Design a protein around this motif. Sequence first.
Motif, mmCIF file in Angstrom:
data_model
loop_
_atom_site.group_PDB
_atom_site.id
_atom_site.type_symbol
_atom_site.label_atom_id
_atom_site.label_comp_id
_atom_site.label_asym_id
_atom_site.label_seq_id
_atom_site.Cartn_x
_atom_site.Cartn_y
_atom_site.Cartn_z
ATOM 1 N N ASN A 1 0.850 -1.193 0.000
ATOM 2 C CA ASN A 1 0.000 0.000 0.000
ATOM 3 C C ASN A 1 0.885 1.243 0.000
ATOM 4 N N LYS A 2 1.410 1.583 -1.178
ATOM 5 C CA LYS A 2 2.321 2.719 -1.296
ATOM 6 C C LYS A 2 1.628 4.033 -0.948
ATOM 7 N N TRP A 3 0.369 4.194 -1.365
ATOM 8 C CA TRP A 3 -0.349 5.434 -1.088
ATOM 9 C C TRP A 3 -0.508 5.663 0.409
ATOM 10 N N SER A 4 -0.812 4.607 1.165
ATOM 11 C CA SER A 4 -1.010 4.765 2.602
ATOM 12 C C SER A 4 0.293 5.140 3.300
ATOM 13 N N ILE A 5 1.399 4.499 2.916
ATOM 14 C CA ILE A 5 2.689 4.796 3.536
ATOM 15 C C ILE A 5 3.132 6.214 3.196
ATOM 16 N N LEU A 6 2.963 6.622 1.935
ATOM 17 C CA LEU A 6 3.305 7.987 1.547
ATOM 18 C C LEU A 6 2.462 9.011 2.301
ATOM 19 N N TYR A 7 1.162 8.741 2.459
ATOM 20 C CA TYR A 7 0.308 9.649 3.220
ATOM 21 C C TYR A 7 0.752 9.735 4.675
ATOM 22 N N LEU A 8 1.099 8.596 5.280
ATOM 23 C CA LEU A 8 1.595 8.599 6.653
ATOM 24 C C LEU A 8 2.866 9.431 6.776
ATOM 25 N N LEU A 9 3.818 9.217 5.862
ATOM 26 C CA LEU A 9 5.074 9.962 5.906
ATOM 27 C C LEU A 9 4.836 11.459 5.751
ATOM 28 N N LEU A 10 3.945 11.847 4.835
ATOM 29 C CA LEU A 10 3.586 13.256 4.698
ATOM 30 C C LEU A 10 2.973 13.797 5.985
ATOM 31 N N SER A 11 2.079 13.022 6.603
ATOM 32 C CA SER A 11 1.407 13.452 7.824
ATOM 33 C C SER A 11 2.370 13.602 8.996
ATOM 34 N N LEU A 12 3.446 12.820 9.029
ATOM 35 C CA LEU A 12 4.393 12.885 10.137
ATOM 36 C C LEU A 12 5.542 13.862 9.914
ATOM 37 N N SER A 13 5.641 14.483 8.742
ATOM 38 C CA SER A 13 6.705 15.449 8.498
ATOM 39 C C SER A 13 6.525 16.675 9.388
ATOM 40 N N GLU A 14 7.638 17.208 9.891
ATOM 41 C CA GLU A 14 7.627 18.405 10.723
ATOM 42 C C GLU A 14 8.510 19.481 10.108
ATOM 43 N N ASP A 15 8.006 20.709 10.093
ATOM 44 C CA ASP A 15 8.763 21.857 9.604
ATOM 45 C C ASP A 15 9.836 22.310 10.589
ATOM 46 N N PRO A 16 11.122 22.194 10.252
ATOM 47 C CA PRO A 16 12.174 22.641 11.182
ATOM 48 C C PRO A 16 12.132 24.129 11.499
ATOM 49 N N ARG A 17 11.551 24.949 10.619
ATOM 50 C CA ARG A 17 11.489 26.391 10.833
ATOM 51 C C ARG A 17 10.442 26.793 11.863
ATOM 52 N N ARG A 18 9.370 26.021 11.999
ATOM 53 C CA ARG A 18 8.328 26.332 12.975
ATOM 54 C C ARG A 18 8.798 25.807 14.323
ATOM 55 N N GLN A 19 9.241 26.727 15.189
ATOM 56 C CA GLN A 19 9.689 26.425 16.544
ATOM 57 C C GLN A 19 8.752 25.439 17.227
ATOM 58 N N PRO A 20 9.237 24.228 17.514
ATOM 59 C CA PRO A 20 8.465 23.259 18.304
ATOM 60 C C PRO A 20 7.791 23.821 19.547
ATOM 61 N N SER A 21 6.458 23.834 19.547
ATOM 62 C CA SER A 21 5.670 24.171 20.728
ATOM 63 C C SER A 21 6.066 23.249 21.877
ATOM 64 N N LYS A 22 7.217 23.525 22.498
ATOM 65 C CA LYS A 22 7.697 22.829 23.692
ATOM 66 C C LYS A 22 6.581 22.457 24.658
ATOM 67 N N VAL A 23 6.206 21.177 24.651
ATOM 68 C CA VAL A 23 5.351 20.575 25.669
ATOM 69 C C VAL A 23 5.757 21.063 27.051
ATOM 70 N N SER A 24 4.988 22.020 27.573
ATOM 71 C CA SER A 24 5.090 22.530 28.934
ATOM 72 C C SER A 24 5.469 21.459 29.944
ATOM 73 N N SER A 25 6.511 21.716 30.742
ATOM 74 C CA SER A 25 6.838 20.889 31.902
ATOM 75 C C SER A 25 5.595 20.493 32.695
ATOM 76 N N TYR A 26 4.479 21.189 32.459
ATOM 77 C CA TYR A 26 3.280 20.969 33.252
ATOM 78 C C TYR A 26 2.667 19.618 32.930
#
Lengths: 50, 50, 48, 113, 120, 120, 115, 66, 66, 199
Positions: free
Chosen positions: D82-107
């Motif tokens: 299922n190439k389409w499903s794997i490609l969609y998953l990979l696209l969905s999990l990509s993260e933009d390095p320029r957008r500062q990670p919303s650091k999960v609050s120590s809270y």
Amino acid sequence: IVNLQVEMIKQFHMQLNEMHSLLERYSVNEGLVAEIERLREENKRLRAHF
Amino acid sequence: IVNLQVEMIKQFHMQLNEMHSLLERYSVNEGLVAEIERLREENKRLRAHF
Amino acid sequence: IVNLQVEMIKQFHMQLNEMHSLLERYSEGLVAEIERLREENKRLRAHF
Amino acid sequence: SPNVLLQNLCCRILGRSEADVAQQFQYAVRVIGSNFAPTVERDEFLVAEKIKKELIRQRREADAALFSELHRKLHSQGVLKNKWSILYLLLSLSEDPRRQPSKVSSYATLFAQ
Amino acid sequence: MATPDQKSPNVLLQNLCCRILGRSEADVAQQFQYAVRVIGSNFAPTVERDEFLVAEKIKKELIRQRREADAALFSELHRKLHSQGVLKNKWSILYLLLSLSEDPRRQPSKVSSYATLFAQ
Amino acid sequence: MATPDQKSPNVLLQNLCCRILGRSEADVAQQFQYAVRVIGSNFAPTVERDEFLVAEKIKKELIRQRREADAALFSELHRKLHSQGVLKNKWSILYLLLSLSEDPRRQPSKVSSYATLFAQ
Amino acid sequence: QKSPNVLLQNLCCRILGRSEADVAQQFQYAVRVIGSNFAPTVERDEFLVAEKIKKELIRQRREADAALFSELHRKLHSQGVLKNKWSILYLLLSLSEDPRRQPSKVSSYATLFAQ
Amino acid sequence: NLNAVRETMDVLLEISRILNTGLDMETLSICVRLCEQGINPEALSSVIKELRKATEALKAAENMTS
Amino acid sequence: NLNAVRETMDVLLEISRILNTGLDMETLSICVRLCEQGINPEALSSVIKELRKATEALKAAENMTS
Amino acid sequence: PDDRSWLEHHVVHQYWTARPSQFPHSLHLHSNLAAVWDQHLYSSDPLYVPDDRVLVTETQVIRETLWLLSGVKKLFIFQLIDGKVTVRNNIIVTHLTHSCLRSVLEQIAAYGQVVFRLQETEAPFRTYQAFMWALYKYFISFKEELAEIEKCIINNDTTITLAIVVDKLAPRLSQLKVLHKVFSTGVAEVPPDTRNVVR
């Protein structure tokens, strides 16, 4: 949204059944109730036989 | 969103009712109390008849 | 919506487990009371 | 079994034993068990194009080329059904390095106990 | 060097609930529980993670409220804040500030007293 | 502070349930509870908190339903009400009325009797 | 006139091919779903639902399925037996499957929760 | 076939590294096997996000306890 | 009326077959009767989806246990 | 903050801050006149929705009034709109009706608006400089009495009421009214484009 709602309802039903079973397992005086009823029957039999 | 809110309220109500029913069925040691009182009266009868 | 659903399901599971644990905690005492009263009656009989 | 594989994957990603990842395994099982609306794209080429556009949008042209090459290699290898499903998953999990990670609050750690 | 005892986010949240309610932390236990439930929930990423984009969105929102002077002031304050460099997470704070802005022109839809029934 | 002897929200909700169901308040207890739950549920902010915008939306909806005369009547009644100044929450009432407007041409989707099946 | 609940239960039993005792969790899930408030369907207009189904089938290069859907819709409209055509059309559109797309064989992983 | 699988896994690892996905070779192989078996990509993405949140919480707990 | 019902059911069966819905004559007839009687199509669709999901879960459990 | 909060409770309540300071007051009819009026209004009109009223202390009201008369800007209760001092609508005092309090505050606000217009004087020319100097001396003379009133309030030994203060200021208030009219005629009635010689 409809898919989410349907999945949530199914999960709610499954969770309700699981909670019922878990409470039955941990609340479970039922075996003790049956043993008390058995002891009542045995004491009644000892009273009838005496 | 309105449908979701209504559905959430309905699901909460249904889950509360299911929990109430499960607790009534499984917590209800009333049968065990009645059977213990019955066994006490039956043992008293077996002692008096012996 | 999918993220919300997954998070809600996880939270529901965690809350169900916590409620189960709380009910187990809040629902041995009888055994200890029986043992104490038995000890007391045996002590009374021996002393008498 | 696929379930054991998913549990092992969770354990590997979390760095804990399968017994220590039970809650995460349960969460994954719950997520997978939920009824999902049909995916927007079930076509391998459409998923690949969406992934390429997302990678280009992050100004990662080298990473976009690397992704296209990896997709070509995967397609030629023919291991995935299922190439389409794997490609969609990979696209969905990509993260933009320029957008500062919303650091999960120590809270968030406060409630873990 | 003993960085002032910035009590852990749980203690800080409890203090915040007590401060907001104007009651002691013990008197805000239901509110504390609600806050803990909210904080433990997975939150969506903020709408804008770019300090300048968030600042521009704030300026646009102030202009939308017919607060053009306030929009200019917001842009200037954002420039000053960016130059000051004191905040480590500019995007998160800017998103928070944008989320907390209130339109003075929109007559408050007075929250029916009935909402208090669920607070308990 | 002129607080009209407003019978408690519970009494009003019970009366509403009884009126809607056509059953006595005692017979609408589940419906009363449902109403209390709905009112207690967090609702998204209303689409329009502007009295005039709500009136215009109602007029537009009536025109879309080919009720142009009803749209004009709604606009005139809204103008009259605004000049009358009798309603304290014109925006909320106007938004409610607009949301409650019904197209006579669109057949009311009769709530299937089937909803009663799950109540048992 | 079997009650809709009994009919749905019989339908579930027939479709799954299992006894009521083996579908108890699924029966409970179905009852919860049917009794749960669902968001309005994507299309509640019979003609709009039929047009959307035809357009979706044509866009997917499924001309045979589009023709079959158009014929079934024409037959349903001409027969006039159904009072709520929109509901049936919406159901059929929601249940349509592309015959060209190989059924996504349910990963064995679903079995973990079955126990 | 084995060489093709190895090449595909290496390509996937390189793509993940360039895209900063955070996936290792074993996790990537597991994801590929799951995808080949027909798992819905939207469900898989939601599961992955929940697993990543759990992994981050576990890593934070391990760093706090160490 | 009976002939019209039969023709409608045959058309629905043909549509289901072309769409590969997996519905049999009895299930389709029950769904049609419910929809004609005013049942909400969303509820009916959710019920059908749940029954299909249950059949797929039972088949997956049987294939994993075999 | 605990010691500071205890002081803040004992150093006079933050009612002057937009934070609602709830203070205990006597429920006696003569002391709960605001509350009794609220009860009667609540009892009388079934259409009556109770507006949110801020309870302010009489001493606090007196102090804010003195500060306004001292020419202080940015009061909390009395807002300056278009050079007109306006009372915030959601303010209530225990001993006054909203309408009565509003009337008294409106008179006070009119005098404050007059002062504010007079307070804004810049002195660009020798004659205008002399007028400003005289105005400053007058404002000094008024501020002297205002400071003495504030001192008497600070001593807190004796019950000082708003009526008592108004009566004490009545001659000064009349002088201020006459001065305001004279100033308006001499300066405010002068067209802006008039030559400094002509002005």
